[PDB]
Design a protein around this nucleic acid. Structure first.
Ligand SMILES: N[C@@H](CC(=O)O)C(=O)O
Ligand SMILES: [Mg+2]
Ligand SMILES: [Mg+2]
Ligand SMILES: [Mg+2]
Ligand SMILES: [Mg+2]
Ligand SMILES: [Mg+2]
Ligand SMILES: [Mg+2]
Ligand SMILES: [Mg+2]
Ligand SMILES: [Mg+2]
Ligand SMILES: [Mg+2]
Ligand SMILES: [Mg+2]
Ligand SMILES: [Mg+2]
Ligand SMILES: [Mg+2]
Ligand SMILES: [Mg+2]
Ligand SMILES: [Mg+2]
Ligand SMILES: [Mg+2]
Ligand SMILES: [Mg+2]
Ligand SMILES: [Mg+2]
Ligand SMILES: [Mg+2]
Ligand SMILES: [Mg+2]
Ligand SMILES: [Mg+2]
Lengths: 70, 66, 153, 116
RNA sequence: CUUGAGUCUCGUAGAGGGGGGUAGAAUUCCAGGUGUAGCGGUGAAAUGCGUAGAGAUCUGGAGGAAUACCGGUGGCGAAGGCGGCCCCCUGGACGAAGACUGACGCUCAGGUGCGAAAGCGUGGGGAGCAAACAGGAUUAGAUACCCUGGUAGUCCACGCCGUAAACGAUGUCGACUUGGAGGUUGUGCCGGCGUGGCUUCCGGAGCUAACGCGUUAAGUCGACCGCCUGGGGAGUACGGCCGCAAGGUUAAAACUCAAAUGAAUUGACGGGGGCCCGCACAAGCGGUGGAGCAUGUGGUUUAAUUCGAUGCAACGCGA
């Protein structure tokens, strides 16, 4: 994430652009993910479980919209 | 969305087409997921292949920190 | 508490100077519900404090408070077994209360004879940063500044 | 003794400590400061505040070189990634580029997960 | 005879396999520059590294291993498994139009082959990680968890081993029986309408002890095979076979118990989650615990020291 400070751009919005620039490539996220060895049996387990919850939230959000709470 | 390769009737994405390829790599050179560019899975696999040919030939970079 | 149904209680201004700030000082000094006994101690010391600095009754009492009022204090919060001291700003009402308590507890532990004399000496040493009431304001500040790195939850 | 006026600040912000190295443009270090060497140990060392202080000290250390324009390279996952940058700008330098240079393998096996 | 089975022609997708080559990021080490006092690690520390110049930063080199992003309840494979890019050799699947053979099919005890990881043998290699091991902590102890190191091993070639929660805990083949939402890969016609293969989720009848399965069945049937017969003893002993070994495989009995078990229900509990409350904490004031005395209790003593209450909820209690 290379950021160049432009003319008439204060520090705060230049630093903030660096926040967004790093978050977009997520350089902090893979840094945590590589900090410890994760077995192939658990990365398949987390990937599978992550998909299940993402599907499970879709069905829950869909079925709620036909249900009234009051 | 709108996979642009199905609309233009392409058959091979042609790694030598760096002008097209650069629309599918991030500012850091990372390939952009097809959830974002709306590319069909079939062409995304050719696109990801073609980007790796270009990176070997130094037509595209691996990263922005070379 | 959990509910927060707390409303403040109206405190009468003192009989002499009509200062509600001094009225709370007497209450802090008061022991065993003897308000009349404590008013005599407060007034006698203020009669001495005024004539010893020539300033006044009330703003000779005020200048001693400004040297004992704390600006930031530490609250313990436990995270992982080891306690973290978290500095926090003191709200204005508590700052007057804290200065008043440190003055009174300082005078009770003195070698002067009469509590009126014990307080009169202690208020004066607060005026030029010599007393043990001012000492604790420094200690509270050093502790808060020592833990300045923890200024977040 | 030497004047440069254009340098690079390398921030090494890990989970445990932050190290601020101010170099010239060629990679020759001029001065450095660390959170651990700035009066902080243990829990206080890994805080964003400790990074800011270590940034001021390095700016206080390399003041005999007359740097005005500064590039910034941020390396590591530490909490001192952001506070260090702000403390350099507040110190009085002109921040030209803010680059994250954290090493990412495209490599070696990481250590095992901690069972705590 | 052509509908099952297969052959041919055109093409499609694919981490299918085997051999070779090469790329970039990072780690580590080696040399050198700049530079100065810490670094590292933890809940916190210490071991450890560092003034013999570390860590940070930069330049050059060596080396090994794995291939970020793409990446997807995506794909391929009988299963185990398979992931940078390129070439070579090679296997299978699928689709569209026909042509061709003419039941050539299905299943399969014994037999043969493949079969994660660990392990074994021989010869290499060795960056990172890491059994064993060493030290530092933690602790009542700590032969652990955590930290600092670290050897076999992990990598390659060849050969053995032949086991895994080798799992979909679901043998293989074939036929039939409402729907919906997807993904992936072909293909005919004009984004729409079909038609195939594979795959994910929800659910109907039906089935099931229930949970659930539900056109990819655990539904309705047919063909063949494997296996089970209460728990423990025990997948153990002995024998045979196999292996260099570690061990694998086949596989008991005496004896012992009256249960062991599966699913679901109501509670209770959790060092599970969420949301609330209370002098529960926090914010404060005054106490108790020290002293003397009052009083109750325990113990001891006594001829008797009446009996009772004796965690909170007995102890200035019945009194
Ligand atoms: N970095 C690559 C390969 C190595 O490292 C990965 O994460 O798979
Ligand atoms: Mg570690
Ligand atoms: Mg053939
Ligand atoms: Mg068969
Ligand atoms: Mg057999
Ligand atoms: Mg192996
Ligand atoms: Mg070996
Ligand atoms: Mg060997
Ligand atoms: Mg270890
Ligand atoms: Mg078995
Ligand atoms: Mg398996
Ligand atoms: Mg499985
Ligand atoms: Mg089985
Ligand atoms: Mg279902
Ligand atoms: Mg045996
Ligand atoms: Mg045997
Ligand atoms: Mg309290
Ligand atoms: Mg007592
Ligand atoms: Mg009694
Ligand atoms: Mg009785
Ligand atoms: Mg009794």
């Amino acid at each position: 994430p290379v950021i160049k400070v432009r003319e008439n751009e204060p520090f705060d919005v230049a630093l903030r652009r660096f926040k967004r620039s790093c978050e977009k490539a997520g350089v902090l996220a893979e840094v945590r993910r590589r900090e410890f060895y994760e077995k192939p049996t658990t990365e398949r387990k987390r990937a599978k479980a992550s998909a299940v919850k993402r599907h499970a939230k879709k069905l829950a959000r869909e079925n709620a919209r036909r249900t009234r709470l009051y | 969305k709108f996979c642009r390769f199905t609309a233009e009737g392409v058959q091979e994405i042609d790694y030598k087409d760096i002008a097209t390829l650069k629309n599918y790599i991030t500012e850091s050179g990372k390939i952009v997921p097809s959830r974002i560019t709306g590319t069909r899975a079939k062409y995304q696999r050719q696109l990801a292949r073609a980007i790796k040919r270009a990176r070997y030939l130094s037509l595209l970079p691996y990263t922005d920190r070379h | 508490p959990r509910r927060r149904v707390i409303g403040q209680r109206k405190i009468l201004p003192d009989p002499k100077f009509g200062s509600e700030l001094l009225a709370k000082f007497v209450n802090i000094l008061m022991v065993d519900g003897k308000k009349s006994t404590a008013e005599s101690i407060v007034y006698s010391a203020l009669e001495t404090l005024a004539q010893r600095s020539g300033k006044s009754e009330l703003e000779a009492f005020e200048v001693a408070l400004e040297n004992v009022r704390p600006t930031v204090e530490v609250k313990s919060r436990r995270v992982g077994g080891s306690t973290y001291q978290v500095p926090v700003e003191v709200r204005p009402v508590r700052r007057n209360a804290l200065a008043m308590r440190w003055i009174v507890e300082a005078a009770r532990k003195r070698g002067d004879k009469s509590m009126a004399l014990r307080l009169a000496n202690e208020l004066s040493d607060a005026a030029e940063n010599k007393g043990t009431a001012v000492k604790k304001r420094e200690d509270v500040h050093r502790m808060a500044e020592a833990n300045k790195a923890f200024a977040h939850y | 003794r030497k004047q440069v006026s254009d340098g690079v600040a390398h921030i090494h912000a890990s989970f445990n400590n932050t190290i601020v190295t101010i170099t010239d443009r060629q990679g020759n270090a001029l001065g450095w400061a660390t959170a651990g060497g700035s009066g902080f140990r243990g829990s206080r060392k890994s805080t964003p505040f400790a990074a800011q202080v270590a940034a001021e000290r390095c700016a206080d250390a390399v003041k005999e070189y007359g740097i005005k324009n500064l590039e910034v390279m941020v390396k590591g996952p530490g909490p001192g990634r952001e506070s260090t940058i702000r403390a350099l700008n507040a110190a009085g330098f002109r921040i030209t580029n803010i680059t994250d240079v954290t090493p990412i393998p495209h490599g070696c096996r990481p250590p095992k997960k901690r069972r705590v």
